[PDB]
């Protein structure tokens, strides 16, 4: 696997979005992964509708603003036969009736792949696939108020995750020791973190569970 990867550089990644006061991080994580796989497939980067996922993917197990899972979102897209663009179906930050319209579908998927629960497997997936949906333990004030640098939380769990995000790459800080990170796109707007991103500690014992529930859609 290369020593660093940043799929933003290759065109795979839309600007940072903001989920607002809705428990829809899973929908943002899933749209980010499918944005990347649709870009690999077609060469077009098209922002996808989280609202479509929030409003419509109850049968697959999602719960709107009460949470959900990226794999359930990928199963919805396969069952539904499509997913609308963000432009056609903009984000409202509350769970509403389903308004999917196939005319405005711009993405599809054929299922999903669950990555083995190990950081080396995650690294190989990031290097060979594109952006990867992951779950993390974000439930510390240190993450809420993260500003810059490598995030390392000694109380983080590797087994109990509570937030869905997107790994867009990995690398290292030049600067001392234990300097590797996962480049993670959050859905808390651009003013959180580093332009909306967090450098997450890498190869530190599966810090915050980043490799424990990683997946991506097949297209
Ligand atoms: C993301 N914004 C988010 N929010 C929540 N909430 C907890 C419940 O109330 C609102 C915020 N939870 C997550 N989770 C945990 C979760 C919740 N649900 C509901 C239905 C099925 C699975 C499920 N997981 C994360 C979502 C992806 C990884 C855990 N996220």
From Swiss-Prot:
Residues 176-177 form a propeptide. The active site is at residues 25, 163, 186. Zn(2+) 4 binds at residues 92, 96. Changing residue 25 to S: Catalytically inactive. Unable to autocleave procathepsin L. Zn(2+) 7 binds at residue 162. Glycans are attached at residue 108. Zn(2+) 6 binds at residue 160. It comes from the Eukaryota. Zn(2+) 1 binds at residue 9. Zn(2+) 2 binds at residues 50, 86. Disulfide bonds join 22-65, 56-98, 156-208. Zn(2+) 3 binds at residues 71, 114. Zn(2+) 5 binds at residues 137, 140. This is Cathepsin L. The chain holds residues 114 to 333 of 333 of the full protein.
